[PDB]
Paper text:
Type I RM enzymes house these activities in a multisubunit complex having ATP-dependent translocation activity that pulls thousands of duplex DNA base pairs through the stationary enzyme, eventually cleaving at random sites distant from the recognition site. Upon identification of an unmethylated specific DNA sequence, two HsdR motor subunits, which bear the endonuclease and ATP-dependent DNA translocation activities in the fully assembled DNA-HsdS-HsdM2-HsdR2 complex, start to translocate the duplex DNA toward the stationary enzyme from both directions, producing two extruded DNA loops flanking the enzyme complex. The X-ray crystal structure of the HsdR subunit with bound ATP from the Type I restriction enzyme of [name] plasmid R124 revealed four structural and functional domains forming a planar array: one nuclease domain of PD-(E/D)xK type that houses three endonuclease active-site residues and a QxxxY motif common to the RecB-like nucleases; two RecA-like helicase domains of SF2 type that use ATP to translocate duplex DNA without unwinding; and a C-terminal α-helix-rich domain presumed to contact the HsdS-HsdM2 methylase. ATP bound between the two helicase domains was found unexpectedly to also contact Lys220 of the endonuclease domain, suggesting a means by which nuclease and translocation activities might communicate.
The three mutant HsdR subunits were crystallized with bound ATP, and their X-ray crystal structures were refined at 2.74 Å, 2.84 Å, and 2.99 Å for the Lys220Arg, Lys220Ala, and Lys220Glu mutants, respectively, guided by the higher-resolution structure of the WT HsdR-ATP complex (2.6 Å; 22). The crystallization conditions used previously for WT HsdR yielded crystals only for the Lys220Arg mutant; the Lys220Ala and Lys220Glu mutants required altered conditions. In the Lys220Arg mutant the ε-NH nitrogen atom lies 3.7 Å from adenine N3, bringing its proton almost to hydrogen-bonding distance with the base edge. The closer of the two equivalent ω-NH2 nitrogens lies 3.1 Å from ribose 3'-OH and 2.6 Å from ribose 2'-OH, enabling one or more potential hydrogen bonds with the ribose. Thus, Arg substitutes structurally for the Lys220 interaction with the ATP base edge, and can make a novel interaction with the ribose as well. Residue 220 is located at the base of a loop made by residues 215–219 that is well-resolved only in the WT and Lys220Arg mutant structures. In the WT and Lys220Arg structures, where residue 220 contacts ATP, Asn221 points away from ATP. In the WT HsdR structure the backbone and sidechains of residues 182–190 are unresolved; in the Lys220Glu mutant residues 181–191 are unresolved; and in the Lys220Arg mutant residues 181–188 are unresolved. The crystal structures reported here show that mutant Lys220Arg HsdR maintains contact to ATP similarly as does Lys220 of WT HsdR, whereas mutants Lys220Ala and Lys220Glu lose contact with ATP.
Author numbering: 13 to 140, 149 to 180, 189 to 583, 592 to 859, 873 to 886
The structure:
């Protein structure tokens, strides 16, 4: 009985007017009542408290007196000092209070029955703003915000903890205009707080369920809702609440059903017992897989659950997270001691480990009791090389097992390259969520891939398709040639802030990575960066330097780098040591070259790249696979990437953040265009690249038509033209209609400008807006910096952009109309783009 349905029957309108908010609320209440949600009238905190007393007393089979209830309220349920985070902690972890009565007996008082869900009492109330609140055992856990049919859901979200304090217990938010319904977690954290994280409910085929009637009839089925709240909502060690998306739940629950059905049939340790999940890169594989293992421990018939990852994919939050379930057993090292120690932990089913360690252990160990136990394996995006050996030993040793795997880049026959196919190893595909689905849902970002062809001397070298010549090409004469490195480094320095959206004043923006071909490349780059930055530091006292850092150790798959720095040669070792010394100096930290020091350097670095304490990370093969950095928008690539490695590296930029991050920038100094198309194609079909790859500069300036949606889009020059024709201003106002039309138009302007900030052509056009009128030192400087010859420099002067001041006036008027709107249904303001500018 899956809560993400294989088949659902699109319901019928009554009807029975569906236009207004109270109409939506009427049908919502009626439908929920048909679904077994008792409706009650609660006008106060007092009445809520009373109702809760009733439900909890019934649920726990106990009766408080007024003194005991008051004490229970003040010290556990209703603590005045409690915030939202404390209530979430109470729902997810601390949901049992061991209470001392007046007669001095001790009893466990549950807020929720998680063992038997349906014993829980669900109820509904309405607003005491049109809202409908779902109470579980009296506690409000769900909030449905209702808006009129006309109201744009993104603006509705844009609009909408203290008192009444019981509403701190809120876990799940849902907001509907009746055409569309979107759910999102309740939290105080602000980094997941944008519209991009709101979610549509769906089926196993990931077909969306937009409207309120069907959302209600599916997501709001008591069994579905309660399972989403209790079993499908992850609370991490940073006290962040993440509600899972339908594809994550579908995959997870299908894995659970698979394990159980395979156990009932006593059919195990063969491909048909387990399964694989194809979840496109960035879709949340680590979150879901770890969650699945944790749920798999809840099966009584299972003795042990292995959750296994690749040390290559480790980073700060993830290690912090694994530490509590498997103390000091998860790291870069080869040591199996922590693994075999956790393996002996009494009354404990979960073991997190790295594939390296599991393989080492399975190599060294023979008679381990676990081999004979009923075991579940969950593999999270493991590289092929280690995985094969691990599989050989796994097959030979564990006698009763169900193994599962998550990947965003499966192994088909056509990419086999010496290894076994994913299907051969894991058997059936239990669920799929592909790249095109993810991009359709906006849960993942597109790529803008561009070869920067600025360098004629090195061009034929950068276009080389032959594998052997490329290997031979790494030296000071060809790829590592001082001028090439200097030109690239100068480009990256010059265009960094532009790429990363640091350009407009006071803007926070993003950061970037530089992926390179080898250790010598990394060294050359770091050195050149320091040199050029010191020179620019001389040239100007107003220069504001970037913070560069690097990490690497020793070696279309991306080559793994061990955490043992001893394997490095002396030159690299000394350069890394020097780099860590400098890093230590600036950041006031102590990390050393030794195993532990380098391990903690890796950790601290991951952390500082995630929060933008470091502006550009110069890496070779590290952090190119699993690294999670939503604020990283740009990857610079001097390296040969193909297929799964290509997709995995590029995906470092694919994390959604908000309206500011439109897509990830991939700026390459070697021609990757063909490899990009091949890679995207392998993992999709011949049309996949059109959905994945962003369109051209010319298309965004002059207009085009999107294939997937079918909609026509302006047309930034068209937008600007309409701004000047229709709104010379202030007289182009004052009526309401003109205000509205202007808000819509300028909205388009802001979205288009924001998009075009990532194109060198537009950056150049904008750049040209200071320049000349007498001394052409800055003219030739403009030509050299933007690599623009005279033939272009002539035409760029012909293209009229609107004056900076006119833009400022537009922006301030836009903001004014917004503030006024606070004190119009179709209209959506760009809050996110505004708040930066
Ligand atoms: N259901 C969700 N709700 C909120 N945030 C989510 C959800 N699922 C994933 N995320 C966020 O998306 C980001 C990427 O998650 P994650 O690294 O698990 O994806 P992945 O597919 O494992 O990535 P990769 O393919 O690089 O290994 C994380 O920061 C995570 O917090
Ligand atoms: Mg991951």
């Amino acid at each position: 009985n899956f809560i993400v349905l294989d088949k659902y029957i699109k319901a019928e309108p009554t009807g029975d007017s569906y236009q207004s908010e109270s109409d939506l609320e009427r049908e919502l209440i009626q439908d929920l009542r048909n679904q077994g949600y008792e409706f009650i009238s609660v006008k106060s905190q007092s009445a809520m408290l009373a109702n809760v007393r009733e439900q909890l007393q019934n649920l726990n089979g106990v009766v408080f007196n007024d003194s005991e209830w008051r004490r229970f309220t003040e010290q556990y349920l209703d603590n005045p000092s409690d915030g939202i985070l404390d209530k979430t902690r109470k729902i997810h972890i601390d949901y049992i209070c061991d209470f001392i009565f007046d007669d001095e007996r001790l009893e466990n008082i549950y807020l929720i029955d998680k063992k038997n869900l349906m014993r829980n009492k669900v109820q509904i109330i309405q607003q005491f703003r049109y809202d409908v609140t779902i109470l579980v055992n009296g506690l409000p856990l769900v909030q449905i915000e209702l808006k009129k049919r006309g109201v744009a859901i993104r603006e509705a979200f844009n609009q909408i903890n203290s008192e009444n304090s019981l509403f701190k217990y809120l876990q799940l938010f849902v907001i509907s205009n009746g055409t569309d319904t979107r759910y999102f977690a309740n939290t105080t954290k602000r980094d997941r707080n944008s519209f991009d994280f709101t979610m549509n409910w769906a089926k196993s085929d990931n077909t969306l369920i937009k409207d309120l009637k069907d959302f209600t009839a599916t997501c709001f089925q008591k069994h579905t809702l309660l399972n989403v709240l209790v079993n499908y909502s992850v609370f991490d060690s940073s006290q962040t609440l993440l509600v899972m998306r339908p594809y994550q739940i579908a995959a997870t629950e299908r894995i659970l059903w698979k394990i159980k059905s395979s156990f009932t049939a006593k059919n195990w340790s063969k491909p048909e017992s387990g399964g694989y999940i194809w979840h496109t890169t960035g879709s949340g594989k680590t979150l879901t897989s770890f969650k699945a293992a944790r749920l798999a421990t809840e099966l009584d018939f299972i003795d042990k659950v292995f959750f296994v990852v690749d040390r290559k994919d480790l980073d700060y939050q993830t290690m912090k997270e694994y530490q509590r379930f498997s103390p000091d057993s998860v790291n870069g090292s080869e040591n199996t001691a922590g693994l075999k120690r956790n393996l002996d932990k009494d009354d404990n089913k979960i073991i997190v480990t790295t594939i390296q360690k599991l393989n080492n252990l399975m190599k060294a160990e023979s008679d381990l009791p676990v081999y004979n136990q009923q075991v579940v394996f969950i593999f999270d995006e493991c590289h092929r090389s280690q995985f094969g050996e691990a599989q050989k030993n796994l097959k030979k040793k564990f006698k009763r097992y169900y193994q599962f795997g998550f990947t965003g880049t499966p192994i088909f026959p056509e990419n086999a390259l010496g290894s076994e196919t994913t299907a051969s190893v894991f058997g059936r595909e239990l669920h799929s969520y592909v790249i095109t689905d993810a991009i359709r849902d906006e849960k993942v970002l597109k790529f803008k891939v561009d070869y920067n062809d600025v360098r004629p001397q090195f061009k034929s070298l950068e276009t080389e398709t032959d594998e052997k010549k490329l290997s031979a090409a790494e030296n000071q004469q060809a790829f590592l040639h001082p001028m090439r490195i200097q030109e690239i480094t100068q480009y990256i320095l010059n265009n960094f802030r532009q790429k990363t959206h640091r350009t407009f004043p006071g803007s926070k923006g993003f950061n970037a990575m530089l992926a390179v071909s080898s250790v010598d490349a990394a060294k050359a780059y770091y050195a050149t960066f320091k040199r050029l930055q010191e020179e620019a530091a001389n040239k100007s006292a107003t220069y504001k330097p970037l913070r560069i850092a690097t990490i690497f150790s020793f070696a279309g798959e991306i080559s793994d780098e061990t955490f043992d720095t001893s394997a490095m040669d002396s030159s690299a070792k000394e350069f890394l040591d020097a780099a860590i010394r400098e890093y230590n100096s600036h950041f006031k930290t102590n990390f050393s070259t030794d195993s532990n020091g380098f391990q903690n350097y890796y950790r601290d670095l991951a952390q500082r790249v995630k929060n933008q304490d470091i502006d550009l990370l110069i890496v070779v093969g590290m952090f190119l696979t699993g690294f999670d950095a939503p604020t990283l928008n740009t990857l610079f690539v001097d390296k040969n990437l193909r297929y799964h490695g290509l997709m995995q590296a590029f995906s470092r930029t694919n994390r959604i953040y908000d309206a500011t991050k439109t897509f990830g920038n991939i700026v390459t100094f070697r021609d990757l265009e063909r490899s990009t198309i091949d890679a995207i194609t392998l993992f999709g079909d011949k049309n996949t690249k059109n959905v994945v790859l962003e369109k051209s500069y010319t298309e965004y300036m002059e207009g085009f038509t999107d294939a997937a949606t079918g909609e026509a889009k302006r047309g930034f020059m068209t937008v600007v033209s309409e701004l000047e024709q229709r709104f010379p201003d202030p007289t182009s106002i004052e009526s309401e209609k003109e205000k509205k039309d202007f808000v819509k138009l300028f909205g388009e302007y802001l979205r288009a400008e924001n998009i075009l900030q990532n194109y060198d052509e537009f950056a150049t056009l904008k750049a040209l807006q200071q320049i000349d009128l007498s001394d052409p030192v800055a003219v030739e400087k403009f030509k050299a910096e933007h690599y623009v010859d005279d033939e272009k420099f002539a035409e760029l002067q012909t293209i009229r952009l609107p004056a900076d001041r006119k833009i400022q006036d537009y922006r301030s008027a836009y903001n004014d109309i917004r503030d006024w709107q606070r004190r119009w249904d179709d209209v959506v303001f760009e809050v996110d783009l505004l708040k930066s500018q």
